[model samples]
Structure formats: structure tokens, C-alpha cells
Target: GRLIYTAGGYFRQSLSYLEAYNPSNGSWLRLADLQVPRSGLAGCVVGGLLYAVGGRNNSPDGNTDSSALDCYNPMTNQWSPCASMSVPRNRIGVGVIDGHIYAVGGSHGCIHHSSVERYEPERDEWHLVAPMLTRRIGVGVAVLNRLLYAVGGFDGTNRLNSAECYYPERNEWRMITPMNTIRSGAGVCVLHNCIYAAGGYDGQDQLNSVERYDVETETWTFVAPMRHHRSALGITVHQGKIYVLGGYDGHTFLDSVECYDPDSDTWSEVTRMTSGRSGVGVAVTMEP
Candidate 1:
């Protein structure tokens, strides 16, 4: 069963899911709404549990950090509150490896952060981990070959193009190939040996570019541009292709969806979402 779940835009947010579509069909259907509305947060799926992590509240000026953690179980079609994170953060990067979840760098209102934390499901506990070298907001995190990769984001004053990798086993981080251009609020996902980062803002303009980082060569290669220029979008890889979900296109929120195929290096439009949004948390519901 091939399915897609997407969350849309900035302050006000919504979540939707679609099923049964060919690569060419590119359409999506709406699903249930999220219990807690949020934006600028990151999400991850572990053992069929979809966890929505820290994010900001609904006020226009309310960009403060949140400790909220919500989990959705697909089999039961229910969402339950989980243990909150230690530090309050928004626009963070989240990844799960070996059943442990790592929540990485994000922002606390006007200030940026470099903090990292690990959450254990069995113990229902959260512990602090080695912090990232760069304090930034809107970074992208993905797990590849057991290593967690943190990509482009904002450093208080400007967007960033740097990339880093953290090894939980060693409790250390090493620099990796950076993105070709600096950006923030971008989306990243891992598919086999490659990592893809797509559609972010560079402070001045929204982007539609896509880039792929090869672990073997430790270098980034340019890929096809997205159909729309966006930031704060949701990106996920299911059934080998990368799906780009709703995001902000500078002035307004977007409900558009696009799919990128590495094999063909092309993009195709899919069904539009019911709602237009950006900066919403996104995750894959491992179980249908």
C-alpha cells in the first residue's frame, strides 16, 4: 500500500493523507486532523508510531519554543500525548535510530540553538546529547546508514549551506557535504544511499531547487527543480520516490504536491491538498 501524509503551512496548520495513486497520477486525499495544531516542528516515524515533536503556538508573534510531543498510532487510528522534550524548541530536526529518537537544533524565538536530546520509548525518558556545533533554525535531519544527518538551516543572521553528521554510538558529529546553496525551512529525506534536500528560502527568495548528497563521494549534485518555489514544506520518501508536500511560497501558503524521481531526474505534479499551509510538522505513518 503506497500512501502519503502531509502537513500544511506556517501559523495555522493541518494534516492530510492520500492513497492509491500511480507515480503519474500524483493525487492525494484528506485524512483526519491533528489533535494539536502547530507549525515549525519536525516529525519522525519509529516502529509504526508517528511522533510530532516540538513546535510553536498559534499566535502571530508567538514563535517561542514548545515541549509538546504527540504520537499517532495508525493501527488504532488514535493520537496520544507522549513525554515532552526537555528543552522548548521550534523548527527543529528529528530522527530515530535503534528505537531512540534524537531531536536536534532549532530556534527559541529570536535566538538560535545547538541543543540535542534523545528520547527513549521503553523508559519513557528524555536525555540530553552532545550539542550540534552550529546553532540554527529550520535545519533538516535524516537517518542514513545508522548516522543522523543535519542539513541546511538558519543561523540567527543568515541562511546556511553547511551539513553535519552525528553518530549516536560514538556521541560525536562530523562535517559532511554541504548543500549547493544556503537555505532555511527546507525538507530532507534519505532514500537508500543518497540524501535529498529540497525547496527552502534564502532570506530573499523562495526556491524550487533540489539537491542530492552522495555518502560515498561526500559531495552534493544538483537535481531537478521543484514545480513550485517554497519553504517550510514537508518532504518524505515512500516507495523509492521523494514526495514534496505543502509549504510557503513567499506570500501565501500552498497545498500543492510534487514528486521527484532520482532515476529520471524529473518532477511531476500531484493532487492538490485540501488546505494551504507551510511550516507544519510532517511524518510517515508506517502502518496503514
Candidate 2:
């Protein structure tokens, strides 16, 4: 069945939890948990397999360098190990270009890594790629027109409004028009042939503002805001509409759901989750 999958996250603590949302009935089904529990993971489906890439586990003992890559098969309903990232990254972001996964900037504990790496499924190898312009954690990543856009995030010292587009062919990242508001942990996804940067933390406040980046025009524009202010929300585009899941509102973690920019430029609440989640990883299955 075609479904939306929400994976690893931190709900007061790191989770190995998994669930599937049936859009036809707007209900969620619990699924098999991750082999290794992770938080702040990057999720994407490529070639029919959902990849839960680099993430970290911050436990009472200490922080685990969870650079492990796990692949999930809908048929098996289980997750299996894959080649891990060269560097440990939590709050990491990812995008696919030509079927290969690119792990972008993320922090390891308090240290932010500006480096990037690309994975080859066939050989199970990860190779270094051109690094981002700035070190970022909680970055929002989306691929538009074959170019990977690394959006707003916290660069350790301060939250960032800066954005960049990566040209795989040229193996370089160029600065793009900055968003109007500085956002950390914004939910970013490709919708309407543009990139949507939703609610996030702007250092002092949790935000509800939304913005769209036009590919052809290479510019950013404002859109309707979400009903609730959130950050580190899981986001993905499924069935031609953008959906955002659990996140934090500065004061509390949220389990509510919402999607916007449909036939109308509006935001509306959708289905709620079983538990509150922040720094969650969400992706849609390739079922036709």
C-alpha cells in the first residue's frame, strides 16, 4: 500500500519507533522499530527502499556516534544495516541526486561538521563531496530541479537564514537568496516545483512563518504560516501536497500534524500522532 512513513526521533529521548500513515483513511499504523535507535535522522526513499541515514543517540551514559545507515523494505517490514556515514552526524539532512544519497551538514554533540558525503548503493560506499559554505545543524534539505538546496539551520554560534544550492555536476555549492527569517530546524520539502521552508526556531522564538523558493527565478517568497509554531518537524511531499509531522514549539513537543499550500495558499491541521516527536525523520514510500 502507498503510505507515509515516520521514523526515528527524540520524544524527550531517542526513539527506535516507526509508523505508517494510511492517507486513504487518515489513520496511522505502528511498524517495526529501527535496529539501532536514533534521533535527528535524515530520511529519504530511493529506488523503493527507505533509507534512515546518519543520526545520533544521546543517552544518559553518553552520546553514541550513530552514523549507521539502515535500509527498510516494505515487503519484509524490517530494517537492515547498510554502509554508515564517514562522520557521525545528528540533526543531519539528506537529498538524492541520480539515485544516490547525499548526507549534508550536521552536528556531532556540540561540534558542527560542514562536510558532506555521497552514498553508492551498489558498492555500499560513501565518498566525500564538496562541503557546505557554513557548518550547520538542524538544516532543511530539499532537491529541486536536480539541485540540492540546503536551507536554514543553526551553525553552532547562531541560527542561520542563509541558503545554498549544490550543483552535483559542478561539484560546488553556491549561495542563494536568504530567507526573510533566520530559522533553525525548519521543515523543508519540495512542493509546487518549489522548496517550502516551514516552522522553525529563530533563536529567540519558535516560528510559524513559511517561505517558498522558486527554482527558475532563484528567489524566496512568503506563504501562509502554520497554525502552531514548531521546529525539527518531519516533512515530506506525498500525493502532490506537502505534509509536516511532529516537532517542538519551544515549550513543548507536538504530536499534531498539518499540511498547506494546496489549491489554496492556506495551512490546515491534519492527523495527530501517537506521541510527541522532535527531530523526526519522515519519508513516503514508492508504491504505485
Candidate 3:
């Protein structure tokens, strides 16, 4: 069963839960609606709370803007709004390390960015952090051994293969190993001390390639490819497997879901979602 957050037929957003493979067993479970409906936002679970970072709302002229952060607590089944970011951005990279959440590079209006900020839930405040070496949008963030890694993303003019690492204790950013290929709009997750980045648009084309970063060697190597090529995908590790949710293909939106098992180096299709979209964010709790 899956719980998906998606917009309804009109403009409002809603949540629906799947009890099993069959639609008959699945039922729509409405939760708190977004304060402002948006896509391309970032989400992460911290201290049992789901934090929704910067995103865009609708515009009459088809333009976009974002400057808000929202939090949802499942235990209370309620949503608590948080302070807005210093700058407005969409398509940002987000990750949690040592109980603090980091929001990385994203677009400001039509411009790409290199800035980053950290949010402390305990104090309900944000502190500006070290910026990346390269200005980028649509980036991916992952944490390994308390170090924050910013992966491939677009710098507006072109896609990038560059990656950087942030050492919080030292309050510095150092250039790290780059990706084998240039891409943007990828999904990243950390497992077993290694970081896996998968499914992104490679400038001219969409890609299904998967790559793993080895902490010991500080290098990246290829892994199994996903069945479908995607960008702006939502990914997370659940039940010992990596689950890739909906994202956009070059041609159409996808509702297909797949899971990857590291041991087998294979992907298997899961229950298809009820809606198709890209740029969706997710937060998972340790529910037994």
C-alpha cells in the first residue's frame, strides 16, 4: 500500500492511500491540503516531522515563485507552517544530517543559485551555510558520514557533472569527484555508507542510469539502469529497497513506480500510482 500526495481534478492538493495492489482495496485518505499548491519542492523527515521546503504556487501569467517551508507531523495528523526562506527558490536540493535539514541550490526567479541554508527544528530558525562551488538548480543532496554532498544539476546555461561536499564541522565546502556524465533533475539516496544517484535528464535526453559513490575511493561507478527514463523524480529508501516514484519523461508524465534491490542489481515494478507528475517531494517515517 502507498500513500500519495497529489492535486485533485481542480487546483487543490490531496492525499490518497493504497491498501494493496487492487484499486478496490485502495481508498483515498485526505490529509491537510498544501497552503500553496506547488511542484518541484523538496521534502525530508527530521525528528519525526515531515518538512516541505521551497516551492512555487500558481501564477496568472504562468510564472512561478517560492519562499515558504511547511511541516507535517503524522502522529498528530496535522500540518504546521514554518518560516519562509530568506530567498525565493524552486527545484532546490534538500537533505537531513545530524538532526538539521539543509536546503541547497535552486532557481531564484529565472536564475540558478549556489546558496544554501540549514534549518534547526529545535530552535525553529535557519542559518545561512556554505554555498556550493558552482551555481546550480535541480540539484540532488545526500548525507554520508555527516558530510553533505551536492550532486549533478543545471547551472542555467548548461547541465553539469560537478559535485561538491560540505563539511559542517569545518563550515567549508570542498570540490569532490564529479559524475561520469552531465545531468540535472536527479534523485539521490544514501544506503550502506554509499550514496546512490539515479534517474535524471542528461541535457539533450532523459536517462535511466544509476551511479554509486564509494566513500572509501571517493569515486563513482555505474549500477543497474532503471526501466524508465525520468527527470524530476521522487526517490526514497524503504524496507531495505530503493523506491522511485513518479517523475516526468521527456514526452509525458509517469505514474509508474519501481523498486531496486542492491543485492540483485535489478528493478521490479510496483503498484502504479493514481496520478502522474514530476517534481513531487516525499517524507517517510519509521512506522512499524
Candidate 4:
């Protein structure tokens, strides 16, 4: 059976919270909390395990950076430690291809890193991989055609519209046609042969506009706008459609969920989450 799993968030103290949603029945279930309270982390499911990457952790004095990589097993409903990243990263982008998770650019303190790291579950180790052409924080990532695509993000001073893809075999990163609008904290995912980017912050405002990139033509075309403006939202492909959950609209955090259907090029408001959350992580578990 297929299930959509969501965890962690920045608003309303959603740190460590984990929930599972069954699209088949439209039901929700609460699960075990993360071992550590984290926000702005990256998540992906591989080999039936849910992996949570580096993010900002809660502390008394102020927020602290984390380099910890944790794995959650569905069978055990528990989180276990994994090899930590060489450096702390919050608001990073992650993608899995060939069962390897790639951790992309993220910021620590005031510095934005252009570095990338790859984790091999079999070896239980992390290796430094080719750096991205540009440093990004709150980057959106997806794997298509066996290539890792890193989309719009913040580059220290400005929101970015640029996009790039990495070919693991050659260890090279190449540029792709940029989105029409500058965006960071965007939600990106693939549907069929097109990559869809939805809801992001473009320096001044939270956006509701969406753009689709055709992998074949290397061009970006605008699609239907989402019902609500959001950024830092969690997005993933579920039931052959694109689903975006909890995010911050300029003024307040949101609990609303919006879904897109490429077949109709229309967006509809779906079920909302239990509480408002931003900077959340979303993934689909591969467990049986």
C-alpha cells in the first residue's frame, strides 16, 4: 500500500511531529516524533526507510544548527542515528536516485554553502560530491530521468529563479532554463515529463503562481495558480497528482493543503492539516 508521510515544521512548535496520510481512505495517523526537534530539514524515503537530513534544532539561548542525519524505520516506528553530514545545514534540498540521497546547498549561520553530499546506505557513509554552480538555501529538488534537479532558492542576498540538474555518473551540474519569476522556499515536483514549481517567496511576496518546465524542450510555461499564496510548503506527487501542504503566507502560517492535476491544469483545495506548519518535510514511504 502507498502512503504519504509528513514530518517536522517551524510554526506552532511542530518540531518533531510526524504524521501519515493514506490517500486511499483520506485518513491521517500520528506517528512517533523525531528523536531531535528539527525544522528546515530535508526528507526522502529509500529502501523502505525514511531519512531526515540536517536542519535547525531548538535551544534555549537561540536556534542551533544541526548536522545530524536520522533514519526512521516503519517496522519499528523508531528513528535511528546515521552518519552525520560534514557540516551543519538548514533549509537544504535533498533528492534520492539509485537509492542514494544527495544533500544539496544550504545555509549555516550567515553563509550559504554550495557544497553537496551523497549518502550511501549500504556503506553508512557520506561522501562529498560535486558542488552546485550556485549556493542555495530553501532549494526545491526532484529526481527525473535519473537526474537530480535543484530548483529556485535563496542565494544570500536575493531570491533565485535559476535551476540546475546533476548527472551522477559524470559528477557534473548543468544549468537549465530559469523560471519566469524569482522564487525561494518553493515546492517542486515532477508529473509525467514536466517539472512543476509552485508557491514560493519572491523576495517581497508569497506567490501563488506556478510554472511547468518541459524536460524535452528545456522551456518553462506557466500553469494554473494555486488557490492560496504559500512558501516553505511541502510538496510531493501522490496519486498521480501534485499535493502541497502547510506553509507560510506572508502574514501567518497556514494549515491548508492545495493539490494540482496536470491532466486538467487546475488546482483545487484539498484537506487541511491538523495544524499550521511551515518549512515542513514531505515524502512517500516505500514500505509494504
Candidate 5:
């Protein structure tokens, strides 16, 4: 009923490849290529389509960040362009609620940003939203109970442990309790009303630690650590499990894959990807 999808990243440099993992078979399959190669992007599923936004493209001579938006229709296995963002950014956080896609904090080249924007698919338009309280890049974002959360990331000067929640009805962001560890490039997802923040850089080193936020209690508590230290990874929830895919750990690009079982409070390594990757975009959608 659910399938995990990952696409576009920096392995050696920017890549356009895409793949899907079937938990039922424990196998990975290559899929269609992206129209635009990128890295540090974020993705979410809305109205049965997977949307990828805001990442950088690396070339032999230089690199450029993008605001380009692309959508993939699994039913047709096709990718198409959509309305672009007003500003180019990478390492941005993305969330979807009530069918609108929200793009949060990210960087514009070397500068961290606090800008926020929302996209209306029906109008093919993007409108400015209330900015976050703090500048962030590599932030992790998730939606729970119809509210959007912006989690830990770097603020250019320092790695952050702070977290905030955005209320769409009020058009406001309120600070919440921070994570136990300062981090950037962590993977985040919501399951059973709890927000899970996984492996990332802690301003000092790549971390294997993991934690979760209780929406009711407004507190973060540590969970099982991952088998490998990971930063710039991709995460998505499928069949109630958290799947963390490839990332860089400062020393090497990774092909390792792992999944977290909340019921058992454990993490187990799964099948490795075909190639090492970092800054990848991941999303999950139901199969027809």
C-alpha cells in the first residue's frame, strides 16, 4: 500500500537518477531520470504526485542553487516542471498540509535564510508566507496534526538545536523546546503523532544519534541510535517505519540504508543503494 521513493543527489556531484524501494520484497529498483540534476532538495507527496523543490546543481567548474520545481506522476512515470520559487535556495525544509506545499528555511549560495513560501498547485503559483524566527539551512521539517514544524539546522554561524511550529490558521511560528543535540542535515518525519529527528552533523562531527518530539508534551527524548553516522540523508515514513537512506558522514559518501521500527524502538540496516549519495530528496506515496 505504501512505497518509498528517492531521487536526485550529490554522489560525486549532482545526479539526476531516481529509484524506489519496495519493503515487501526488500528490493530497490531504478526508475526514471530527473529532468534537472540537483542536490540538497526536499520532497513531499500531494494529490498523488511527488514534488521536488529547491536544491543546488554542481558542475565541473562551479555550483548553482535552484528554485526549480518538478513533479512526478508515478501513474505515468513522467516528470514535469512547475512554477519556480521567487528565490533560489538549497537545503530547504518542505512540508505539505491541506494540499499546499510549504518551503521553509534554506541557503542562498553561502548565506542562510529565514524566508518561507507556500505553493498552490491549483493556481500554479507561490506566495510568500511568514518567515521563521531564525535563519536556517539544512533544517528538517514535518507535518503533524495539520501543523508544520521546522526543526534543527545550521544558522551559518552555528548549528542549532531549536525547533518551532507554524500555525497556518494564525500565520505565525512559535518556538518549541529544542532537540537534545545541536544538528544540521538531519532527517525528520512524523509517525503516530511523534516527530523523529535522525542522524546529522552536530557542528563537531557526524552523529549517529536519534530523537523524537512528543507533540503533546513538547519535549524531545532520545531513541535508538543509527548504525552509521549520517548527514544530508533522505528520510520518509512507510508502513509505519522510518527509512533513512544514503548520506555523507564527512569522510565518505554512503550507500547504506537503515529503517527504524518504532514499536521495537530499534534500527536495522536494510539493503544498500546502488551507489553512494548525499543531499538526496525522498518521499513516500501509496501504490495504485
Candidate 6:
């Protein structure tokens, strides 16, 4: 069975709620609440458990950065605390490789950061990793062909269109082909060896454009845009299709959902969520 999970973000206010979407039934069900209310966090599923890391406790303008690590078990419908990060951060880019979760660049309040860290669930500990080449916030991260990719983000001064990839063996981050458009808060996912970057903000406006990076060609090409312009959205790949969820569009929080099929190179609307959200974290897993 396929499952999609979304957690923690701002609607009218900061949220601690978590929920899951079942495509088979086209329904969303509340799962468990996070231990702390937050937004702009990063989340990934590894070894069948959901782990949410680094976020902010309030609005970006007047917020406290968090190092909170919360883990959830779907079977038990419960959430538990894990060892926090070494530094407080928000809007992190995250991915899972070899059973470890990697938290990448984000902001420590108003300050953009380049520090990176890895978490070992087996040891319940976090250790520092090599920093990214550029300081960023609201970056999109995904793992493709064993390499971790950091996509477009804001660097305080300007919205960024650059991209980079991390080589764990060398503990190095190298710049890659930049995206066609500057974006921050885009949703990213890997499908068929390509990294797809979806809707985000481009400094002055929320965006609906999409782009994909082919690992084999090392090139980026435009893809079909989503139905709605969004920023700070939740995204995941499930059964070969991309699911884009709730986000803000400058003026309002959105609950609209959409799906993209790479084979057809098309996008279609999906059921809306019960509540609007932005800066939420999303993940996909198969049920036993």
C-alpha cells in the first residue's frame, strides 16, 4: 500500500498536527500531533519511521529557531522525542541515505547557514557533516543515484537558482547546473533517476513553474507547471507520480493538492486538505 504523510506548518498559526493521505481511498486522516508546534521543518522516512527536524516556533519575522527532533510510528500512532541537533535551525533541506538522515542548509533565525549534520537512529545521535558551498534557507533536497542534492533556495540577499550535490564518500559538495528559475520553498522529489523541483517563491512572486534535473545528462529542463502557484509546500513521489500539497500563495494559505505524471508530462488536481498550510513536511512509504 502507498501512503503520503504531512506534518507541522502554519495555517492561521503555528501547527503541531500530523496527517496522512491514502490515494486508494482519496482520503486524508489525522495521525498524531507533533510534540512542538513549528513550521519550516524538514522531514524524511527511514526504516519505517518518520523523523521531523529543525524548524521555527512562530512566524519567520518573530520566531525562535528549533533543534527539536520528533519521531513518529504509524503503527502506534505516537510521537516521541529524539536527540536534538547541535544548532537551532529552520527551513532545512533533508534526505535519507544508508539509514541515516541528513539535515542540510537552513536559517538560524534571520541568518542563513551552511552547516550540515547527519543523524543515526541506531545510535540516537547527531554528528556534523561537511557544510554546503552556499548558505541557504528553504532549499529543496533529495537523494538520487546515491548522491544528495541541494536545490534552489533563498540566500538572504537574493532568491537563488543554483544547485549542488553532495558526495558522501568524499564528504564534499559540488555546484551543479542551476535551475531555470530562482526559487525558494519548492517541493523536490526523485523519480526515475531525475530530480523534480516544483512551485516556490522567486523573491517578488509565488511561482507555478517546474523543472527536472536528469542525473545521467546533468541537465535541467522545464516541465509542466502546477495548477496553482505555491511556496513552502509539501511534496513526495509515490508509485511514480509526484504529489504536491498545501502551501501559501503570497496572499493566503492553501489546502489545494495536485498530482503530476511524468509519463504524460501533465498535472491534475487532487482532493483538498481539511486545513490550509505552508512550510509543511511530506514523506511517502509503503505499508506492509
Which model scores highest in lDDT?
5
- State, as a TM-score between 0 and 1, how close model 3 is to the true structure: 0.89
In the range 1-93, model 4's lDDT, one tens digit per residue, is 277778788875538888877777777788899988888888898888998888898655478777889998888889999999988989988
Every candidate's lDDT: 0.77, 0.88, 0.76, 0.88, 0.90, 0.89
lDDT of 1 by residue, 55-124 (tens): 7766545444677777766666667888988878788888888998899888776768888999998888
Q: What is the lDDT of candidate 4?
A: 0.88
All candidates: TM-score: 0.90, 0.97, 0.89, 0.96, 0.97, 0.96
- Residue runs of model 1 more than 4 Å from their true location after superposition: 7-32, 60-64, 286-288
Model 4 off-target regions past 4 Å?
12-14, 59-61, 286-288
lDDT per residue for candidate 3 within 110-176, as digits (tens), equals 7788999988888889889888889978898888898999999999798988898998989899988
Give lDDT tens digits, candidate 6, residues 1-288: 378888898876678888888888998888778988889997799888888889888954566889888988887888899999988879988999999999988898678988889999999999999999998899999998789999999888988999999999999999999999999999988989899999899988999999999988889999989999999999998888999998988887999989998889999997898889999988876542
TM-score of model 5 vs. true structure: 0.97
Put down candidate 5 lDDT per residue, 118-188, tens digits, no spaces.
Answer: 99999999999999999999999999999999999999899999999999999999999999999899999
TM-score of 4: 0.96
Native-to-model Cα distance after best TM-score fit, residue 209 in candidate 5, in Å: 0.5
Worst 10 residues of 4 by lDDT: 57-66
What is candidate 3's local distance difference test score? 0.76
lDDT by residue for model 2 over 183-245, one digit each (tens)? Answer: 999999998778989999998988889999888887889898899999889998877788889
Q: Candidate 4 has which clashing residue pairs, if any? A: none
Number of the candidate with higher TM-score, 5 or 6? 5
Off by over 4 Å in 6: 59-62, 286-288
RMSD of 5: 1.2
User: Which candidate, 1 or 6, has the higher TM-score?
Assistant: 6
